[PDB]
A paper describes a structure:
HLA-DQ8, a genetic risk factor in type I diabetes (T1D), presents hybrid insulin peptides (HIPs) to autoreactive CD4+ T cells. Here we report, the HIP (GQVELGGGNAVEVLK), derived from splicing of insulin and islet amyloid polypeptides, generates a preferred peptide-binding motif for HLA-DQ8. The crystal structure of three TRBV5+ TCR-HLA-DQ8-HIP complexes shows that the TRBV5-encoded TCR β-chain forms a common landing pad on the HLA-DQ8 molecule. The N- and C-termini of the HIP is recognised predominantly by the TCR α-chain and TCR β-chain, respectively, in all three TCR ternary complexes.
Numbering used by the authors:
A (entry chain E): 3 to 29, 37 to 58, 63 to 72, 74 to 81, 83 to 254
B (entry chain C): -2 to 14, 30 to 132, 140 to 219
C (entry chain A): 0 to 9, 9A, 10 to 180
D (entry chain D): 2 to 6, 8 to 30, 36 to 58, 64 to 68, 74 to 201, 214 to 217
Write the structure that this text describes.
């Protein structure tokens, strides 16, 4: 489909950002959009044959580029707090139906002093649930992380499982009165009673945090919140 | 009312993008008959005065006119996205933009102006500035309609949404003659008559 | 060709490579409805009736003409870089109304079979280039895929008869000077 | 936008989901498009139409002959069809793509055997911390209670155990006061 990189991005004031997008094979009309809760889907600019056919009403700091293989790029200069958004890429055959990509979640902050990795913990199912419904439910808890750029996945015996899993759709703000509040996310894994009561089964809640890079600068006394994988585990027990 | 549209130029198959000149044309033509009862959309892809690929609503698919655009017509038929809107443009573009012609163009009437002036003997009945370019101009000589000695130039399109024609008459001046010039035009409920008398 | 009660040209997309120039216009029964200024991004209707009831977004032209620039470089490479044959134009000068020696009138210079659409029209009054009161229409399409352009000159008839229409084109060896007086 | 939609729309899982849309000001040259999107994710193209009723294998779309309104129809609404569905118009002439309010569709699941219970779980790394879990409750239950001081409650969550086609709702709540009680407000 429509390839769009990078997926997540965390920047500060004054920096610049270059976004890329590979369209559908056979398409050569790449459209750019900015999706914000306070402005909706705003058109940016459209590139077709290495030229800017259509253009919105955005400042000169929002520029674009396109190459011969229809892959388009977009650059922003002198980022502001209002520039943080989900930048979408719409691939079109020419003027026909547009197909959007995954989008690049951009975040602009005054500084990196409030970037935290999640503290992931796994909660074993109580013996009272296993005796009543004959089903064990593990609860994973990731709290105290910013931004919400995070991905959770369960692993059983080193294999990522999807059957019987569930994750909260949107993270929860621990201080809703503050806009810089650390987020929190929960997810559940439900298995049979006999499967949890087998010591050979190994349950692990993996959490992928997209934060700072190894090339960014860090000054705070806290450990650098680089892109890492925080995961807690819980072995099955048979009592 | 709402914004109008035009013909959609289908994309070519290449791997992206006196003095000499290379000209590329594209005409979104449409042929209405009996109002909006027989609309026909025919888009023409022309390269240097040579039409190499065309679409026809009566056909339903693209076709190559010259051996220059089989690669374009066969590719424009393969893409379902292109053929979907190209077929639908007869309703999207033509059958829609024709409805504005009723409000504007097809209701436009302009009364012509008729003047008879000799040239020294040739008489010239000059019908000028009219629309919609449908007229019947006749030369008479005292209740008898002249024909053999009448020159009729073709309709002259002035380019400013008006038309012009000149109907001439060779004659022999006989005392008592009256040369009337009938002009029949849709904007005129009754025809305009201009006469030139024989005297002296 | 095709017989019909009315023929509309809702495309007339043009783009040549001599000078990177284009033209978008809609035509109904041979006459031009409007033309899109590809530089100022404006729709210029040729009738006041259209300016009060019609509507057209000039972005469609810029979106459409950009496809011609792609297809032009396309078919050039498929046609072994085949140039355009310079057809010989022909000029016919006449008046919009019967000219009287006192009441002003409009002089019309019609140039037919213009291909490629790279032509100039300049009025010559007594050997001098008449500049005040000169207007010309955009290129108008023809069935044989050529063009024809019409020029105008607002004047007042008098004893001066030198009213030529200088037309320079590649199909002509020397510039044509066609002057006609009723 | 030139369209209008109802933002509050939910239906039962498996049954048809008729998402309406009114566009009285649409012209004969404007298509009707339908996009859905999970927030924080790229929008997904569904189906588009101009005249007549068209059917993609994802969903169907009907348009009235007078063109005043159109409805998006989902045959069997599943759990994955719970995004925000947008109804937009387009000239299909290289123009922009403008979204409106949309329709937040929620697919209420089917709970054949509801058994609401308030469980309490213990952390494996430290028995001091704990969380509580409300599960096997009704699908049509407003589980979102107001958060107090250091008392957090999450939204619902539907687990689909494909090994035994068993589905049930669930919601996690925790606190930092470590004096967990997790009190249990009537069910009907
Ligand atoms: C077309 O011709 C038929 C013949 O009777 C007539 O009834 C109709 O009004 C005409 N115009 C249309 C269908 O637009
Ligand atoms: C006249 O047209 C010719 C093209 O044949 C070219 O020299 C130029 O476009 C024009 N020059 C002048 C002086 O008008």
């Amino acid at each position: 489909g429509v390839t769009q990189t990078p997926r997540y991005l965390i920047k500060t004031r004054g920096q610049q950002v270059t976004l890329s997008c590979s369209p559908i094979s056979g398409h050569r009309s790449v459209s750019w959009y900015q999706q914000t809760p306070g402005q909706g889907l705003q058109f940016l600019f459209e590139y077709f044959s290495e030229t800017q056919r259509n253009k919105g009403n955005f400042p000169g700091r929002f520029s674009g580029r396109q190459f011969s293989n229809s892959r388009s790029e977009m650059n922003v200069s002198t980022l502001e707090l209002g520039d943080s958004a989900l930048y979408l890429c719409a691939s079109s055959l020419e003027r026909e139906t547009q197909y959007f990509g995954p989008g690049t979640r951009l975040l602009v902050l005054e500084d990196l002093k409030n970037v935290f990795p999640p503290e992931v913990a796994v909660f074993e199912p109580s013996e009272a649930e296993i005796s009543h419904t004959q089903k064990a439910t593990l609860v994973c808890l990731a709290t105290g992380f910013f931004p919400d750029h995070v991905e959770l996945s369960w692993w059983v015996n080193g294999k990522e499982v999807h059957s019987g899993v569930c994750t909260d759709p949107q993270p929860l703000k621990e201080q809703p009165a503050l806009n810089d509040s650390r987020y929190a996310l929960s997810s559940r894994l439900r298995v049979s009673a006999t499967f949890w009561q087998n010591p050979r089964n190994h349950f692990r809640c993996q959490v992928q945090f997209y934060g700072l890079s190894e090339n960014d600068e860090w000054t705070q006394d806290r450990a650098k919140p680089v892109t890492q994988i925080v995961s807690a585990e819980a072995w099955g027990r048979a009592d | 009312g709402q914004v109008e549209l035009g013909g959609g130029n289908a994309v070519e198959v290449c791997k992206g993008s006196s003095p000499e000149d290379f000209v590329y044309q594209f005409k979104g033509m449409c042929y209405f008959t009996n109002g909006t009862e027989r609309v026909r959309l025919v888009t023409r892809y022309i390269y240097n005065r040579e039409e190499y690929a065309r679409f026809d609503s009566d056909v339903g698919v693209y076709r190559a006119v010259t051996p220059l655009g089989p690669p374009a017509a066969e590719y424009w038929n393969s893409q379902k996205e292109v053929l979907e809107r190209t077929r639908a443009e007869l309703d999207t573009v033509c059958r829609h933009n024709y409805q504005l012609e009723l409000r504007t163009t097809l209701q436009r009437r302009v009364e012509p102006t008729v003047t008879i002036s000799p040239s020294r003997n040739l008489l010239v009945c000059s019908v000028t500035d009219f629309y919609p370019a449908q007229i019947k101009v006749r030369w008479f000589r005292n209740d008898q309609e002249e024909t053999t000695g009448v020159v009729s130039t073709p309709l002259i399109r002035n380019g400013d949404w008006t038309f012009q024609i000149l109907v001439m008459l060779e004659m022999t001046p006989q005392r008592g003659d009256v040369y009337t010039c009938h002009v029949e035009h849709p904007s005129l409920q009754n025809p305009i008559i201009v006469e030139w008398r024989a005297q002296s | 060709d095709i017989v019909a009660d009315h023929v509309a040209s809702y495309g007339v997309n043009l783009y040549q490579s001599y000078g990177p120039s284009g033209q978008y216009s809609h035509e109904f029964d041979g006459d031009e409805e409007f033309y899109v200024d590809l530089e100022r991004k404006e729709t210029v209707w040729q009738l006041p009736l259209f300016r009060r009831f019609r509507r057209f977004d000039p972005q469609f032209a810029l979106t459409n003409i950009a496809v011609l620039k792609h297809n032009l470089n396309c078919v050039i490479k498929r046609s072994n870089s085949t140039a355009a044959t310079n057809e010989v134009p022909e000029v016919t000068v006449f008046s919009k109304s019967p000219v009287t020696l006192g009441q002003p009138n409009t002089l019309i210079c019609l140039v037919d079979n213009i291909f490629p659409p790279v032509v100039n029209i300049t009025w010559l009054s007594n050997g001098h280039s008449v500049t005040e009161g000169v207007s010309e229409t955009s290129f108008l399409s023809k069935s044989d895929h050529s063009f024809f352009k019409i020029s105008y000159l607002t004047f007042l008839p008098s004893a001066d008869e030198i009213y030529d229409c200088k037309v320079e084109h590649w199909g002509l060896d020397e510039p044509l000077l066609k002057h006609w007086e009723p | 936008m030139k369209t209008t939609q109802p933002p509050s729309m939910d239906c039962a899982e498996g049954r048809a989901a008729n998402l309406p849309c009114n566009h009285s000001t649409i012209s004969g040259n404007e298509y009707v498009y339908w996009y859905r999107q999970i927030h924080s994710q790229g929008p997904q193209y569904i189906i588009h139409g101009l005249k007549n009723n068209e059917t993609n294998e994802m969903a169907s779309l009907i348009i009235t002959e007078d063109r005043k309104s159109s409805t998006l129809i989902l045959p069997h609404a599943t759990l994955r069809d719970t995004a925000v569905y947008y109804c937009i118009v387009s000239h299909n002439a290289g123009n922009m793509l403008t979204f409106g309010g949309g329709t937040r569709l929620m697919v209420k699941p089917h709970i054949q055997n509801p058994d609401p219970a308030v469980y309490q779980l213990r952390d494996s790394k430290s028995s001091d911390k704990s969380v509580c879990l409300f599960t096997d409750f009704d699908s049509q239950t407003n589980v979102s209670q107001s958060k107090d001081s250091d008392v957090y409650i999450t939204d619902k969550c539907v687990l689909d155990m494909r090994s035994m086609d068993f589905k049930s709702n669930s919601a996690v709540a925790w606190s930092n006061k470590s004096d967990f009680a997790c009190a249990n407000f009537p069910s009907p």
